[PDB]
Short mmCIF file of C-alpha atoms and ligand atoms in Angstrom, two decimals:
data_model
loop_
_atom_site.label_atom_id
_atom_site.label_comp_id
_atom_site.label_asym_id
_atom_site.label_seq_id
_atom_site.Cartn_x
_atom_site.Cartn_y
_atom_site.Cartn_z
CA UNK A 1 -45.62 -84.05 -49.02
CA UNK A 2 -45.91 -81.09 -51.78
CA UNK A 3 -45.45 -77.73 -51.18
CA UNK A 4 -47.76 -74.60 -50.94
CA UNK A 5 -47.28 -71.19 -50.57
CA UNK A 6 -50.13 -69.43 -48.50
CA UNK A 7 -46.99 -68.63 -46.38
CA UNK A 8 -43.91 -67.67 -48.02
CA UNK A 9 -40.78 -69.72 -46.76
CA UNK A 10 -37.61 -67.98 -46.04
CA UNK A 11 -35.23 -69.30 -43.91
CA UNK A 12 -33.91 -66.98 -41.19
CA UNK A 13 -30.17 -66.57 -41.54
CA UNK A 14 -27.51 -67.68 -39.00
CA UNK A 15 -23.66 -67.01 -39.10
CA UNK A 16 -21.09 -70.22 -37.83
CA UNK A 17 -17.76 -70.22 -38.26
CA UNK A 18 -15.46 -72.65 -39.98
CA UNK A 19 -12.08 -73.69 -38.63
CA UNK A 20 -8.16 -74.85 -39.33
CA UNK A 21 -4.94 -74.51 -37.18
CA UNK A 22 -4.72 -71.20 -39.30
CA UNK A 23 -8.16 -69.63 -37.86
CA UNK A 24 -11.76 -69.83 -38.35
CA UNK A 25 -13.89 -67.92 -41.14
CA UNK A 26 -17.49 -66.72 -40.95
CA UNK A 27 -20.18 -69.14 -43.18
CA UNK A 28 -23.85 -67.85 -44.46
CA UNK A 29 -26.19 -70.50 -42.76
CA UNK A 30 -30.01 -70.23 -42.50
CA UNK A 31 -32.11 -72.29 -40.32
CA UNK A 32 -35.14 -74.53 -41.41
CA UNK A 33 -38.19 -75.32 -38.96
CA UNK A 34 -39.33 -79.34 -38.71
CA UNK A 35 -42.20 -80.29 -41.11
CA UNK A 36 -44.45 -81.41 -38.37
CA UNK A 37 -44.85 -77.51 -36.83
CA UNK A 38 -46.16 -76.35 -40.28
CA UNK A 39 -49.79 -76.09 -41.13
CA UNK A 40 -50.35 -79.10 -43.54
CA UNK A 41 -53.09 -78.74 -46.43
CA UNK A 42 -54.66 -79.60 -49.18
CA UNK A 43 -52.66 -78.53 -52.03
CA UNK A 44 -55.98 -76.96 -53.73
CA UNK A 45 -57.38 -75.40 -51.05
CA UNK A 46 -56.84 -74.23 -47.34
CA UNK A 47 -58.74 -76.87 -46.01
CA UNK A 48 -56.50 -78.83 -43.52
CA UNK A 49 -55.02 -82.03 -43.38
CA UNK A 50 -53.90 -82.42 -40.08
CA UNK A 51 -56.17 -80.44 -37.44
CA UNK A 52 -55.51 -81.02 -33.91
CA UNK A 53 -54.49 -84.30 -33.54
CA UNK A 54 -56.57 -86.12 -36.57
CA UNK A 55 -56.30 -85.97 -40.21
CA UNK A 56 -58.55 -85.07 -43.00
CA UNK A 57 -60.31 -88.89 -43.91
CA UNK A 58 -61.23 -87.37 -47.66
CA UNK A 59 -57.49 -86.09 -48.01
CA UNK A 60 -55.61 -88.63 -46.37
CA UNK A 61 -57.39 -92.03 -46.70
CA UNK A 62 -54.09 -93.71 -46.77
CA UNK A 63 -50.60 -93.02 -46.49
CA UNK A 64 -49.17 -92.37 -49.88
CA UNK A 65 -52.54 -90.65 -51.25
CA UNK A 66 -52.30 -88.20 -48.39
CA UNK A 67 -48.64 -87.18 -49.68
CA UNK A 68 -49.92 -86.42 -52.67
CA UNK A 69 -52.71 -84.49 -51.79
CA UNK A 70 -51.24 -82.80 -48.99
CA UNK A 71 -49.04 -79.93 -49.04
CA UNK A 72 -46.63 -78.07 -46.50
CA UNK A 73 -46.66 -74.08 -45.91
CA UNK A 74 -44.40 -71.71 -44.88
CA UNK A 75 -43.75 -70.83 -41.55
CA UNK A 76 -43.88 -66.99 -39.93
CA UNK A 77 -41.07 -68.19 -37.88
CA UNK A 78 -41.18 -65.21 -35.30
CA UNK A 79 -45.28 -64.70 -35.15
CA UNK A 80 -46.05 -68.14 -34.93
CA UNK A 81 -42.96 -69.88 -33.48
CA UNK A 82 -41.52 -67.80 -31.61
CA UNK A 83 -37.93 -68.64 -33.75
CA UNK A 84 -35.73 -65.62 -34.27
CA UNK A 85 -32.04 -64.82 -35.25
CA UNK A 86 -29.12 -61.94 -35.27
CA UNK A 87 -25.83 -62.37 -36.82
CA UNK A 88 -24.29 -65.56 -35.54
CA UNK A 89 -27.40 -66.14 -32.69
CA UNK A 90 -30.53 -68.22 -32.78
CA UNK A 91 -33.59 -67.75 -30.07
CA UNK A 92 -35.49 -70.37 -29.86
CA UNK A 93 -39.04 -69.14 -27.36
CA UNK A 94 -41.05 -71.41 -25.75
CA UNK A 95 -44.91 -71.11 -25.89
CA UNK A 96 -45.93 -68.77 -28.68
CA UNK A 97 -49.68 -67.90 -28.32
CA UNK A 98 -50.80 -71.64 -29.13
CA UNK A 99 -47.30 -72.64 -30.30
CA UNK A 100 -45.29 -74.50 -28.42
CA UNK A 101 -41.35 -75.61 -28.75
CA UNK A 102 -39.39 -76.17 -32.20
CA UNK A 103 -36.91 -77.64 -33.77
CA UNK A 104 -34.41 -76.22 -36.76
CA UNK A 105 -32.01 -77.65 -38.96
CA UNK A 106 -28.91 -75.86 -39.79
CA UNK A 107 -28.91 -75.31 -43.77
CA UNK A 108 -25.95 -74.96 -46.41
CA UNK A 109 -28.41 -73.63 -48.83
CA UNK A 110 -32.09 -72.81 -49.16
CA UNK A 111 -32.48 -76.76 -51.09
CA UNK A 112 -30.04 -78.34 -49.07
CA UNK A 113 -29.02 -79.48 -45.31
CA UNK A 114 -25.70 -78.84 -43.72
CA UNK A 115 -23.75 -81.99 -43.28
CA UNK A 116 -20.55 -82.36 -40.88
CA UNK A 117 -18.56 -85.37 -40.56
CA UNK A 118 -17.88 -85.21 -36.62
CA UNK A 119 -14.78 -87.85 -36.68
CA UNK A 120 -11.42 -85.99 -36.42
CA UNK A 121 -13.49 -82.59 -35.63
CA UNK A 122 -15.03 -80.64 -32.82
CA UNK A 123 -18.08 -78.62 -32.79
CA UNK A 124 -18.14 -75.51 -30.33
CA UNK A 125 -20.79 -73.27 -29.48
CA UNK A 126 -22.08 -70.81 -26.66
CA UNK A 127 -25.73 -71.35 -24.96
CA UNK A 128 -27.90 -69.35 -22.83
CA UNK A 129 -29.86 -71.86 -20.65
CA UNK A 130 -30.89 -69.28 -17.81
CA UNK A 131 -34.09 -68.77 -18.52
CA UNK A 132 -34.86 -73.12 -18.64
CA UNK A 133 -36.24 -74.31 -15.64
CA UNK A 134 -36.85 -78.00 -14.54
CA UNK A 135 -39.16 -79.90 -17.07
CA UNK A 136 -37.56 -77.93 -20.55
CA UNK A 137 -34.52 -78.51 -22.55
CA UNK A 138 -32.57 -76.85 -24.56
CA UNK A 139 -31.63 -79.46 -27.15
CA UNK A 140 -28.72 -79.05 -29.65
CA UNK A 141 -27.84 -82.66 -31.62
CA UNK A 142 -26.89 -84.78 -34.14
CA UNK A 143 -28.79 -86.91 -36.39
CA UNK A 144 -27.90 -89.18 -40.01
CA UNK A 145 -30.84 -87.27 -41.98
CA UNK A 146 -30.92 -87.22 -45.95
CA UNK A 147 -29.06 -83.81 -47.00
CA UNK A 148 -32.09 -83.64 -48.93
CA UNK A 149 -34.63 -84.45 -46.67
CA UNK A 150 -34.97 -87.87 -48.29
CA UNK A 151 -36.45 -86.48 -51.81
CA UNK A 152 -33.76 -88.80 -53.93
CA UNK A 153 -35.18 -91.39 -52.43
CA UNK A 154 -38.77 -90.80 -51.85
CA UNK A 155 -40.66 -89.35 -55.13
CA UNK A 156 -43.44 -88.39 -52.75
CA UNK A 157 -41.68 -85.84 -51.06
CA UNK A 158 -41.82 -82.81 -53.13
CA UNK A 159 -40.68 -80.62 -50.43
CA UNK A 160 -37.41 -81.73 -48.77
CA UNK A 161 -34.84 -80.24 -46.73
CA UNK A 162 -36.61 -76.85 -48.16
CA UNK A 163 -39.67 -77.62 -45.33
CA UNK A 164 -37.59 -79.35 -42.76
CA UNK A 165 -38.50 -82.96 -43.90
CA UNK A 166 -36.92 -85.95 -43.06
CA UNK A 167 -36.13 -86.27 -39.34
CA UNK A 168 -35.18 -89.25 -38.11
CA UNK A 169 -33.17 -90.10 -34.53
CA UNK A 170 -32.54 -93.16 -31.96
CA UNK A 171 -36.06 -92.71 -30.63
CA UNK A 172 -37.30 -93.70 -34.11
CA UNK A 173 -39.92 -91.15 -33.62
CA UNK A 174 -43.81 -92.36 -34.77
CA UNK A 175 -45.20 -88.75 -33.86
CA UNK A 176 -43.88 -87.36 -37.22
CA UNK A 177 -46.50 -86.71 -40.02
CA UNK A 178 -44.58 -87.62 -43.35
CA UNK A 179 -41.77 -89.95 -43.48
CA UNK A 180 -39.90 -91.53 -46.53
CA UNK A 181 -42.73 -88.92 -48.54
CA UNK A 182 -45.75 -90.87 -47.16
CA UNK A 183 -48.31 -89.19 -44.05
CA UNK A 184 -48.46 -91.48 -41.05
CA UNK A 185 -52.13 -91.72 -41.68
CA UNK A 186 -52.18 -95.09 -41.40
CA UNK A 187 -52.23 -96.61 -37.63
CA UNK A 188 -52.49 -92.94 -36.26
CA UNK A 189 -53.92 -92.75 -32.48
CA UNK A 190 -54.31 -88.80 -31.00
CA UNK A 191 -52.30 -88.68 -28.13
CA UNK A 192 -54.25 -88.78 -24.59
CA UNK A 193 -52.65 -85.22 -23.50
CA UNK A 194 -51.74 -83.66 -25.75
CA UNK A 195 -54.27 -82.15 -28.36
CA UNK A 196 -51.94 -81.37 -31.19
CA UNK A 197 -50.23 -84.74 -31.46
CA UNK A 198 -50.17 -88.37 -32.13
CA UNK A 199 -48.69 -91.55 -32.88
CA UNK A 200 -48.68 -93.04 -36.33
CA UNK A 201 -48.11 -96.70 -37.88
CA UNK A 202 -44.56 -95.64 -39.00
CA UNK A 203 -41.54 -94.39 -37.21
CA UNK A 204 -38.26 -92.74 -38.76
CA UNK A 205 -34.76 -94.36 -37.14
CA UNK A 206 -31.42 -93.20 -37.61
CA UNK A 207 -27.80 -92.36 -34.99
CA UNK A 208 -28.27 -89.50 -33.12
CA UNK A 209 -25.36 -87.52 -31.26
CA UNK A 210 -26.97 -85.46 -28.32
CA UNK A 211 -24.06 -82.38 -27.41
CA UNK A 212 -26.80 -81.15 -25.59
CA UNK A 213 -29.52 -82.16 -23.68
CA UNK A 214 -29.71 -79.40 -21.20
CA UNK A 215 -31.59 -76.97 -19.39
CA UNK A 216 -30.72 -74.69 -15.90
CA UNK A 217 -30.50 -77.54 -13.56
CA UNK A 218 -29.06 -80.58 -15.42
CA UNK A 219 -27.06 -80.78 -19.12
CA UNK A 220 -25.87 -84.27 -21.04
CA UNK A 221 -23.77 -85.68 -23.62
CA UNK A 222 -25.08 -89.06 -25.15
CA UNK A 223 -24.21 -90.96 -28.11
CA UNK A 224 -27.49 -93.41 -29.53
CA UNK A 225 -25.98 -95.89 -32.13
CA UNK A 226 -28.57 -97.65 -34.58
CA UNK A 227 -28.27 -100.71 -36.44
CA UNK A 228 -28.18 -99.11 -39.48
CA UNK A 229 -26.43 -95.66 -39.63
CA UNK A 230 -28.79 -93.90 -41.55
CA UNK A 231 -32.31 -93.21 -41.84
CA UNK A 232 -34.46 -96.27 -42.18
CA UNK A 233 -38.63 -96.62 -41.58
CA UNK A 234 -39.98 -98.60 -39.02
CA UNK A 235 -43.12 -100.38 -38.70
CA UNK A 236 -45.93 -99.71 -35.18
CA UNK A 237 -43.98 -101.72 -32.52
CA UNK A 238 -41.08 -102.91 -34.02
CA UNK A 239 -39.83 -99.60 -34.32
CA UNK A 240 -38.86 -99.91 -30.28
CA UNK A 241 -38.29 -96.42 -28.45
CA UNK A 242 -40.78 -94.51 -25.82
CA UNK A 243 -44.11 -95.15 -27.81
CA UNK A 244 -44.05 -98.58 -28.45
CA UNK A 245 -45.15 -101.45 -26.31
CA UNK A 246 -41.08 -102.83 -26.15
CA UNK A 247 -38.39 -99.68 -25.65
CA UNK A 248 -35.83 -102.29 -27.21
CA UNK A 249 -37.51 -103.89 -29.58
CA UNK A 250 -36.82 -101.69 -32.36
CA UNK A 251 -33.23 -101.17 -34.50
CA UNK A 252 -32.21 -98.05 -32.09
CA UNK A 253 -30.70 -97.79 -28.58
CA UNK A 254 -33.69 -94.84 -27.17
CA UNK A 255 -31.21 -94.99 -23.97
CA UNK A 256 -27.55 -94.08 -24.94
CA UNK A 257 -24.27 -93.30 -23.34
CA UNK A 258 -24.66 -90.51 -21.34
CA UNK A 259 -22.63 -88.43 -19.02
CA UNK A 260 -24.65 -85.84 -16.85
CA UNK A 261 -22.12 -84.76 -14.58
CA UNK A 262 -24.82 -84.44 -11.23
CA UNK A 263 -25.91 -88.05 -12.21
CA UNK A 264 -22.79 -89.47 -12.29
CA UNK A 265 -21.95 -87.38 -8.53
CA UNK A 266 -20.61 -83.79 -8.82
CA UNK A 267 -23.81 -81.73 -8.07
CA UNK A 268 -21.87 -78.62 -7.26
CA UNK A 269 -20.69 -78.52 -11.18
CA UNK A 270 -23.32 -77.28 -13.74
CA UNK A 271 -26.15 -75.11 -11.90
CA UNK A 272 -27.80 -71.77 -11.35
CA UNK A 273 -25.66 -69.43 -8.82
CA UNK A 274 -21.92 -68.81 -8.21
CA UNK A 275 -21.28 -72.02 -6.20
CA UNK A 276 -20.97 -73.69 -8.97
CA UNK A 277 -18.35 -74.28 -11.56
CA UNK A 278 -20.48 -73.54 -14.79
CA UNK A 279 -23.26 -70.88 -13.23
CA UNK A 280 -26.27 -71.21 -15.54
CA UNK A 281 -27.69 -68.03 -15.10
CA UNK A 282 -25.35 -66.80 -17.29
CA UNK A 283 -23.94 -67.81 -20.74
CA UNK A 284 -21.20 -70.63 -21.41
CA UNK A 285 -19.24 -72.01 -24.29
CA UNK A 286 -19.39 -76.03 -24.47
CA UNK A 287 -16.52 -77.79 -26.73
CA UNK A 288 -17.17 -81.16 -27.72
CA UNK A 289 -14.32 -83.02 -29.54
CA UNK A 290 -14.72 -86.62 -31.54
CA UNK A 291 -11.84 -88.52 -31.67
CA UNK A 292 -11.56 -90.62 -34.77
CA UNK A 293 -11.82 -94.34 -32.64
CA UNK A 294 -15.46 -92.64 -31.20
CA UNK A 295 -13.47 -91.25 -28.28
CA UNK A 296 -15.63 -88.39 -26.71
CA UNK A 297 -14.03 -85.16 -24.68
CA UNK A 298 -15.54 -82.03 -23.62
CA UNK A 299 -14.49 -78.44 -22.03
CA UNK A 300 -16.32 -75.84 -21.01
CA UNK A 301 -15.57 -71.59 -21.04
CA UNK A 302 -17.64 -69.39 -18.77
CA UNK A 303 -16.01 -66.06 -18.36
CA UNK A 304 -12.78 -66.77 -19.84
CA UNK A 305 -12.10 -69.54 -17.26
CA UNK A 306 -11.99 -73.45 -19.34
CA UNK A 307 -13.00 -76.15 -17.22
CA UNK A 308 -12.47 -79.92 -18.45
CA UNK A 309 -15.15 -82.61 -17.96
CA UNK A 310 -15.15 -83.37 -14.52
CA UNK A 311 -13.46 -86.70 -13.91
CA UNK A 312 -16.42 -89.74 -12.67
CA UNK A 313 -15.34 -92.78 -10.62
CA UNK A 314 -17.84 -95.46 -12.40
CA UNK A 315 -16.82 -99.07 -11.30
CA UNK A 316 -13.27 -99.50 -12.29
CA UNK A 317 -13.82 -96.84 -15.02
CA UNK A 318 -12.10 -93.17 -14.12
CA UNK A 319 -11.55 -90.64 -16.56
CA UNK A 320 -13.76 -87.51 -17.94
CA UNK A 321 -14.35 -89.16 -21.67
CA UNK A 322 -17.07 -90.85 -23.54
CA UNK A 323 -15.26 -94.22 -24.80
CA UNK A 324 -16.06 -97.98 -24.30
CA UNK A 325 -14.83 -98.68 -20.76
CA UNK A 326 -17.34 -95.71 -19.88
CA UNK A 327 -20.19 -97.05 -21.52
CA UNK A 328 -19.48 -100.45 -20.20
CA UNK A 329 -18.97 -99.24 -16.52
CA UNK A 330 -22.04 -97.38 -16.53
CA UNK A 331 -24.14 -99.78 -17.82
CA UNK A 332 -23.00 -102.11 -14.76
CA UNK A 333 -23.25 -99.37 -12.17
CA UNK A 334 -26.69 -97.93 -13.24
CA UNK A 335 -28.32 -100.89 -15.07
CA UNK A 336 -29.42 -101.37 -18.85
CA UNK A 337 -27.62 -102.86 -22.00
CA UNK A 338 -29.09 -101.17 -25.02
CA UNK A 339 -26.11 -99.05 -25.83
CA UNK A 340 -23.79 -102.04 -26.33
CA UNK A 341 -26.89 -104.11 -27.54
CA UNK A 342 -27.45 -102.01 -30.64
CA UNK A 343 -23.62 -101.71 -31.40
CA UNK A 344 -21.57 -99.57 -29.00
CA UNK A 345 -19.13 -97.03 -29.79
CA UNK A 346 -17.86 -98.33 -32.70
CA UNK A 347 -21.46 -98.50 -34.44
CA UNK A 348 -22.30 -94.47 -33.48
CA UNK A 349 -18.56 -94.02 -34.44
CA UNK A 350 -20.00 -94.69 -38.61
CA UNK A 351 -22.22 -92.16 -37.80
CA UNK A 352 -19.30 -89.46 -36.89
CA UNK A 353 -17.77 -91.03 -40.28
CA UNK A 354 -20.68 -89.89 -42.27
CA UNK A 355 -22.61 -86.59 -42.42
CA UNK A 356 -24.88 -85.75 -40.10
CA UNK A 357 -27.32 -82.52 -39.52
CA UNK A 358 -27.39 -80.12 -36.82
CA UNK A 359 -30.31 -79.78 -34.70
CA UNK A 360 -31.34 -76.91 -32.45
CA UNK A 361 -34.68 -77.41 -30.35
CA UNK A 362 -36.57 -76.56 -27.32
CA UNK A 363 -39.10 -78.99 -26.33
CA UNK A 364 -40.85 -80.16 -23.18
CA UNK A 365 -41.84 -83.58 -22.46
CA UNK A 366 -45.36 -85.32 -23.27
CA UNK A 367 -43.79 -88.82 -21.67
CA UNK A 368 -41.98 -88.58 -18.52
CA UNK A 369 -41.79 -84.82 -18.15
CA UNK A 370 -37.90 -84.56 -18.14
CA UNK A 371 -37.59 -86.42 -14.96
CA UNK A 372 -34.46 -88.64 -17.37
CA UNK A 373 -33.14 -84.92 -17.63
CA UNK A 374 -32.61 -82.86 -14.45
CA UNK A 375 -34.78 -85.23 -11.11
CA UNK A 376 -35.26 -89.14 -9.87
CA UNK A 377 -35.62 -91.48 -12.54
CA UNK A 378 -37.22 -94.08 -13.31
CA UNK A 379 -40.27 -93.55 -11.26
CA UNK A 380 -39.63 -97.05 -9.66
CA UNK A 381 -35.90 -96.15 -8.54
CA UNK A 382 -35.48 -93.79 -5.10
CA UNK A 383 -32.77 -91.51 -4.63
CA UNK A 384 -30.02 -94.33 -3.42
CA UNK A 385 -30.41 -96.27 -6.22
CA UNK A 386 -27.12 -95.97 -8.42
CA UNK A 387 -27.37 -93.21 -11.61
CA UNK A 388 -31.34 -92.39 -10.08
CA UNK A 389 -30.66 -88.71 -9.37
CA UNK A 390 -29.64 -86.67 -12.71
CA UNK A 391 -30.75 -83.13 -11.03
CA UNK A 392 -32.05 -81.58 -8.28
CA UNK A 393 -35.57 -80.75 -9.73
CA UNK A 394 -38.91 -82.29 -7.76
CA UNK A 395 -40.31 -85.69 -8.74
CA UNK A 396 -43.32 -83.39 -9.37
CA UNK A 397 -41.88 -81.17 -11.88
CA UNK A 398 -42.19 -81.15 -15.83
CA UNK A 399 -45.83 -81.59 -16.29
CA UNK A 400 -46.03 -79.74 -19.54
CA UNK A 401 -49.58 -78.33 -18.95
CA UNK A 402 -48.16 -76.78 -15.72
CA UNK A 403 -44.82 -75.57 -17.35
CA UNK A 404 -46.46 -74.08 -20.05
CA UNK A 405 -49.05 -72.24 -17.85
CA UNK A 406 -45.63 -70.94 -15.69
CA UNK A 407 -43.14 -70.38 -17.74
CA UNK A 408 -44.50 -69.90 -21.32
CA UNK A 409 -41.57 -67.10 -21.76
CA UNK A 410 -38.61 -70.16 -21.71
CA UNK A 411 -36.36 -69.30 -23.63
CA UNK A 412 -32.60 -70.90 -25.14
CA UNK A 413 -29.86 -68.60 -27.10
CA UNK A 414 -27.82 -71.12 -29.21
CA UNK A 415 -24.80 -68.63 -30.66
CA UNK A 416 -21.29 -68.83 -31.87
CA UNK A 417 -21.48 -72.16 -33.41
CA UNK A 418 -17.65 -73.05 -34.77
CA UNK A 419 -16.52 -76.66 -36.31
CA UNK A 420 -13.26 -77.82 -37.16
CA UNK A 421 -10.33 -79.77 -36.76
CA UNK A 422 -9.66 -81.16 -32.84
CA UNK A 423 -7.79 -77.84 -31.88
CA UNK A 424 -8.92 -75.52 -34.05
CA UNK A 425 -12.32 -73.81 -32.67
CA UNK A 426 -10.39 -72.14 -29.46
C1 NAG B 501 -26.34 -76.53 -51.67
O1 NAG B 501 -25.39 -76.83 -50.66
C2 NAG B 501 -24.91 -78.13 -50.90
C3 NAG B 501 -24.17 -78.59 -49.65
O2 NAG B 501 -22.98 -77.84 -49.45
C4 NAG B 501 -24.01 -78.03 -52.13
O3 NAG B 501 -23.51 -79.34 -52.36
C5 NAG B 501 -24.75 -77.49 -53.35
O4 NAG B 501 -23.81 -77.08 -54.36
C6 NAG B 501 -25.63 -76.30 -53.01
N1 NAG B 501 -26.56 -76.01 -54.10
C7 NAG B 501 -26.76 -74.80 -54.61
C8 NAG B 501 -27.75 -74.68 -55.76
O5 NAG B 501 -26.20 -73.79 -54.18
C1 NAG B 502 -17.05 -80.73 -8.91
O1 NAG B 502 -16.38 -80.33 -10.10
C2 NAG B 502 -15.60 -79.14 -9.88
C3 NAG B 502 -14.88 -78.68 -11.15
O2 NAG B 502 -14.14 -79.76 -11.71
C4 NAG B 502 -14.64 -79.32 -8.68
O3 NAG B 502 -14.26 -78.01 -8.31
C5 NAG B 502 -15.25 -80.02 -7.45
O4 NAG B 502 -14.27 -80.39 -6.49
C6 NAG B 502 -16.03 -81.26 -7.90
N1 NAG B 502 -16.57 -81.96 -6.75
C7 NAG B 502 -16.48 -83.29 -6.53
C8 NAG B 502 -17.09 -83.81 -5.26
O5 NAG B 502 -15.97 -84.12 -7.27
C1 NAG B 503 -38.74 -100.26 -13.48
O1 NAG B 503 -39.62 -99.49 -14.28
C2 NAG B 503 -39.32 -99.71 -15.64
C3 NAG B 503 -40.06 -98.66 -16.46
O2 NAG B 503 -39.38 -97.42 -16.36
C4 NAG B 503 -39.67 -101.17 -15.97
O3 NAG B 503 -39.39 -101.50 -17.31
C5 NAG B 503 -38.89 -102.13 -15.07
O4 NAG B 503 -39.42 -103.42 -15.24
C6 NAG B 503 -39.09 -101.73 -13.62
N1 NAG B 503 -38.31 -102.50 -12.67
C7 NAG B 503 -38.87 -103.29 -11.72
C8 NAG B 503 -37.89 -104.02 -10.84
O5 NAG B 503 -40.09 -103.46 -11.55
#
């Protein structure tokens, strides 16, 4: 895609701290908003190429025409999105007059993303999830995107990590407008229920780290290895994931590794009101430390107190870590192979050995209304069924027509963001 200017684009700033054994030190981030939120048009004109769910036929007759005809604006990132930040904070709103959700990349510079290399290190930040209810999450993650958005690569995209170009995770996503600086033209079918989206003939793959997949009622840490590390296109149904006509067809695991400590039996840990460990009506710190074998351990702070992982019983597998056995155990106890299928541990582990980008979101759910997240899942399991329950929320809940109509004002504070050395963010 190209770039216009209707709409100047400045990202809004955001403080994070790097650290050693010697202390941490305050860095000048800004934040970028995804490329599929903007207004897309024609690089002459205002008239749109994207509108609703279809795209302009004269613009956009195919793929890499459409990319060159097509530009990206700038985003009012508070009017229209409902994205703020102060200091070392970022508020991410929910529905924003007809807006609804986003998702921001953490920059190094105004061209360029920021890239960590997880292995060895430990990212550490504080969230606000009070104001989530069943059917939202609060999403901070991990993906191998292009520092650059993919520009080196892709001559047709003129507008890189600039406009928030080149997402890619283990769902390899076919919703996304431009990927590898082509539209998704090409194959695209408007989605049933929801009037601003669709599904396109090409998908974008790469690892993807969830921290956080979270909102007031359920929160969970899951590694999704690809085949290959990075970002790669994928083609209609062999790109596998949620929209696709085979989940594991494609060169990603969509499932993961997760730990959600209610699914895996301690419902008294994470949840809103003093009875429980972490209460999510107010603010909490989440550590998350990567071993260099792929070895994943977490702590929590909430008032000053630091609570470890709870330790799970899954088959023969006890301990509070993300590693192999884990992985392995839960597969057994609550069904499913992809993890291991597309590589395991050691296969996300590249991924912690290369860069990857930090993403911050808020998002409901078009597909199965977050019912994975924080209630009963699948539909076709009951509540006995091992690993079904992952919350306490109804089987009912999550529609996003009805959670936007009653709780537009959702809402996720994503602040003190520190990285560094195992050790060092405390
Ligand atoms: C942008 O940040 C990247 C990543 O740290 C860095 O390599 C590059 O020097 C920066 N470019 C400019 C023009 O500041
Ligand atoms: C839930 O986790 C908390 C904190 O580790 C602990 O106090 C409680 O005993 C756990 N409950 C069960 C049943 O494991
Ligand atoms: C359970 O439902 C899933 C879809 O979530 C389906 O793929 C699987 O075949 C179903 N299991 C049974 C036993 O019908």
């Amino acid at each position: 895609q190209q770039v216009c200017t209707q709409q100047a684009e400045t990202h809004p700033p955001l403080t994070w701290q790097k650290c050693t054994a010697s202390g941490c030190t305050p860095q000048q981030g800004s934040v970028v908003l995804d490329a599929n939120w903007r207004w897309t048009h024609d690089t002459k004109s205002t008239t749109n190429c994207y509108d609703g769910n279809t795209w302009s036929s004269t613009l956009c007759p195919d793929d890499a025409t459409c990319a060159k005809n097509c530009c990206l604006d700038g985003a009012n990132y508070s009017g229209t999105y409902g994205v703020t930040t102060s200091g070392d904070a970022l508020t991410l709103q929910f529905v924003t007059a007809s807006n609804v959700g986003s998702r921001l990349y953490l920059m190094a510079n105004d061209s360029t993303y920021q890239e960590f290399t997880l292995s060895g290190n430990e990212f550490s930040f504080d969230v606000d999830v009070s104001q989530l209810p069943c059917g939202l999450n609060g999403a901070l993650y991990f993906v191998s995107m292009d520092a650059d958005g993919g520009q080196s690569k892709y001559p047709g995209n003129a507008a890189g990590a600039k406009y928030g170009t080149g997402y890619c995770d283990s769902q390899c996503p076919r919703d996304l407008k431009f990927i590898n600086g082509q539209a998704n033209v090409e194959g695209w079918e408007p989605s049933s229920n929801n009037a601003n989206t669709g599904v396109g003939g090409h998908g974008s793959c790469c690892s993807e780290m969830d921290i956080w997949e979270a909102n007031s009622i359920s929160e969970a840490l899951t590694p999704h290895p690809c085949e290959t590390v990075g970002q790669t296109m994928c083609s209609g149904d062999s790109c596998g994931g949620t929209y696709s006509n085979d989940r594991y067809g494609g060169t990603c695991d969509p499932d993961g590794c997760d730990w959600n400590p209610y699914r895996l039996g301690n419902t008294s840990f994470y949840g809103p009101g003093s009875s429980f460990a972490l209460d999510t009506t107010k603010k909490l710190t989440v550590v998350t430390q990567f071993a260099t074998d792929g070895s994943i351990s977490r702590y929590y702070v909430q008032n000053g107190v630091k609570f470890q992982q709870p330790n799970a019983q899954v088959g023969s597998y006890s301990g509070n870590t993300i590693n192999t056995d884990y992985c392995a155990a839960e597969q057994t106890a609550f069904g499913g192979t992809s993890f291991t299928d597309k590589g395991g541990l050691a296969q996300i582990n590249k991924a912690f050995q290369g860069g990857m980008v930090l993403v911050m979101s808020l998002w409901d759910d078009y597909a199965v209304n977050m019912l994975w997240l924080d209630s009963t899942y699948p539909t076709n399991a009951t509540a006995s069924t091992p690993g079904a329950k992952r919350g306490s929320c109804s089987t009912s809940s999550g529609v996003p027509a009805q959670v936007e109509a009653q709780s537009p004002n959702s809402k996720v504070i994503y602040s003190n963001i520190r990285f560094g050395p195992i050790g060092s963010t405390g």
